[PDB]
Every structure is written in C-alpha cells, then in structure tokens.
C-alpha cells in the first residue's frame, strides 16, 4: 500500500518536518542541513546558497550577508465554543436540499473533505510550490499584521520572507486570487458552493464584464498572525479550507445591533486599537483544523487567529438564501467607502443578472403553474428596490459602470414589480 510523493535533497527523501533544510538557489532543490553540512545556526549568515553539485559550475555559496497584546487580548477573553451554533455536517450530506432546509443561517464545519466535491492539492503541497504556479514575479497583497497595513510586493519577495528564520515582521498573504494562474487548475470550489453561487449559475458566458474574481483565494498565514474582524465584501458567503496547519475563527452573528456596531467601529480611524469582540454579546471561537472546511454565512463578522504556519484556500459566493443580508452588508460597505482591495468586483452586475433570472422564473411560474418560493419573491422585492436606487436619476452615474450590456433597467424594474404584485396574491 504505497503512493508517489515529492522528494528532496541528495538523499531523495520526502519532506521531514523535524529536519532543517536549505534551498539551493541554482537548482531550486531543498537540501537537509545534515546532508550538505550546513547547521541551522549557520543559515542566517548565508546570502546565496549553492549545493555542492551546483557549486562546481555555478560558483561557491555567497555565505556573506555582510501586535502581541492584540493576540494576547484575543486569547485572554473567554468565548463560547462554536459547537453551540456551528453545525458539523459530513460533506456527502451538505447538499442543496440541506441548505434549503436550514437556510444557511449559521456556519457549517465539514471535518473531512469527502463528499464536499472540493478539489485541493495534497498536504504535500508547500508555499514553495505556490510560488511556482502562481508566479514568482506576481505582485501580491501582503498584510503587515503588526502595523495592520497592506503593501504590494513580489510574490518571490514574500516567499523569501516566509522561508527565513527570525521573522522580524508578521506578514500575511490573505488576498491572493489565483484563478488567473496555473494553480487555478489545482483548486476547485465545493460542489455545494457552485450550486449556490449566483455567478456560477446566472452569469452569462457571453457577458462582456469579467466575472467576480473572488472564487479561488489562497491564504498563506504565518505563525502568530492576526486578521481583524471584518465582513466579506457584498455580504458574500465564504468557504475556508485549511490545507496545512490550523486557523481559529471568531464568528459574530450579523444581528441588527452587531452590524451597526461593526460599521461604527470599522469607520473609526482608530479601529486597529479597539478590540471589537468586546462590544458584542456573543462571539464564538471556532477552531478549523487541517483538512477541515468552514462555510461562513452572509454578513457574519469574523476574525481569524493563526497559531501555526497555515496554508488555506478560500472563496466568496452569493446565494438566494441571504438576499436581504447580502444587500445590507453591501450598504454598510458602500457607506464605509473603505479600500477596494478586498472588494467584491461587479457585485451589482451579479445582482442585475440575478434580477433577470427572477423575471424569467416569474414568467416560468406562470407557464409551469407553480408559485415561486416566498424567499425568492422577497429577494426579488429587495433586488428590485436596489435596482431603483441604483438607476435613480440622481444616482445613475455611480452604478452605470456595473450595468450589463443591452440592459433596460426601467423595463426590468417595471416587469419585476408587476410580477411580484401578481405573486403576492
């Protein structure tokens, strides 16, 4: 009972986590500190390392170099366990019918990928591999966790930081969407996500606007890193899968009071010095371990703590079960006018496409002789109201850029209102 896995070093052995290794810059191969006679304490002094085979022709190694309280305050506060609200469901039982029954109102934790339909690389997939497929020269968004600021840099420059010792900075890559890279073919969203996604179901293949590039996020979180409380852009529901390590989620239900507190907190310039979990009633501590998948519903205010080096894949999506919440979080995001780095591209365009489908569903309901579900009719009313606000004569200029081609909002709005009026009877 065997399989084939990558190996390294001259010894041609698989990666052993208890042995110090150094990557030769010439052949890009990792060598054990024992195999090539380089002790771990010697590693910081080495600027360029060449293995002995490469040293013969590529030259000798250039062995000439020449906050904490926020984490402590997070671990200090006592939080209810996520077992109270976060449900555990096997992947095979996490179906579209299950979503309709439970309404997707609380987070779901799937301990085993089996049945989810999720496609991820094997645990023998390392950050060095991420650099090769995404691209060493690709500019990525790196978050200075201590300073809570974002800075763009080369991916090879960050992965150089990742594969170093005595990391004087706490840097994270949580905004790396690789759907346009070679690594896009390695990760596919869970089948439940694709069924629920508005873009997956209702976005035309001939659409001139690019689809929201929010499907295949990759996360590389260093040890003792911290991600502050936030709402995914556009109230988008999210799925997080931990390939290696683990990550702790602090989830707050998007109650009316909690959402108002978040907006007031997030808008404050000193929001990086205010622990938001101390303002809410209940904040749940969810530990998502290696190989586990966490589904986060629309609008939930969540923060992540990373105790060990963790590699995770995430994705955002929009579904018909939380149309009201998705709009409300978008309204909060629109009023905040925060940075558009974590934004949801063409969120309104997806709504316009959804509204077009609802009109066709209303027409089909007349032909099929069946009433549309009440949550769709209510969601149509919510979307129709948003359509009027977006295409109001005073505010059409802002939302016109996200209007799909060959679209008559006045015709679409009037038809939706009439069909909704009919369906209410």
């Amino acid at each position: 009972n065997m399989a084939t896995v990558p190996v390294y070093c001259v010894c041609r052995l698989p990666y052993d986590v208890t042995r110090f290794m150094i990557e030769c810059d010439a052949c890009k191969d990792w060598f054990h500190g024992s195999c090539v006679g380089v002790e771990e304490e010697e590693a910081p002094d080495i600027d360029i390392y060449h293995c002995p085979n490469c040293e013969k022709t590529h030259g000798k190694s250039t062995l000439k170099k020449k906050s904490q309280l926020f984490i402590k305050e997070l671990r200090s506060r006592t939080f209810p366990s996520a077992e109270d609200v976060v449900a555990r469901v096997p992947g095979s039982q996490l179906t579209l019918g299950y979503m309709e029954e439970h309404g997707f109102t609380e987070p779901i934790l799937v301990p085993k990928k089996d049945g989810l339909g999720l496609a991820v690389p094997a645990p023998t997939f390392y950050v060095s591999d991420v650099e090769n497929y995404v691209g060493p020269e690709r500019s990525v968004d790196v978050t200075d966790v201590t300073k809570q600021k974002d800075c763009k840099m080369k991916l090879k420059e960050f992965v150089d930081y990742y594969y170093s010792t005595n990391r004087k900075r706490v840097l994270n890559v949580t905004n790396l969407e690789f759907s346009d890279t070679r690594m896009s073919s390695f990760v596919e969203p869970p089948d439940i996500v694709k069924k629920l996604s508005w873009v997956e179901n209702y976005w035309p293949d001939d659409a001139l606007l690019a689809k929201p590039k929010v499907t295949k996020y990759c996360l590389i979180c260093v040890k003792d890193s911290y991600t502050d409380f936030h709402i995914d852009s556009g109230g988008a529901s999210a799925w997080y899968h931990v390939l290696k390590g683990e990550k702790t989620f602090y989830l707050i239900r998007p109650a009316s009071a909690n959402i108002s507190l978040y907006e007031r907190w997030r808008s404050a310039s000193n929001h990086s010095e205010m622990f938001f979990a101390d303002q809410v009633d209940k904040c749940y501590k969810c530990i998502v371990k290696q190989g586990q998948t966490l589904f986060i519903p629309s609008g939930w205010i969540y923060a992540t703590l990373t105790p060990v080096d963790c590699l995770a894949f995430a994705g955002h999506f929009l579904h018909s079960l939380s149309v009201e919440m998705q709009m409300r979080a978008y309204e909060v995001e629109r009023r905040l006018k925060l940075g558009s780095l974590t934004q949801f591209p063409n969120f309104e365009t997806a709504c316009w496409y959804m509204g077009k489908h609802l009109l066709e569903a209303f027409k089909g309901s007349h032909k099929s002789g069946k009433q549309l579900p009440p949550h769709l009719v209510q969601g149509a009313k919510i979307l129709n109201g948003a359509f009027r606000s977006w295409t109001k004569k005073q505010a059409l200029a802002e939302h016109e850029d996200e209007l799909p081609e060959h679209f008559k909002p006045s015709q679409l709005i009037k038809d939706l209102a009439k069909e909704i009026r009919l369906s209410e009877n």
Binding site: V17, T18, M21, I22, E23, W30, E40, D47, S128, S164
Partner: peptide, 7 residues
C-alpha cells in the same frame, strides 16, 4: 537563502 526550520 531560503530555509526550512525544524519542529
């Protein structure tokens, strides 16, 4: 260069 620590 790039290194991998122990555990």
């Amino acid at each position: 260069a790039r290194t991998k620590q122990t555990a």
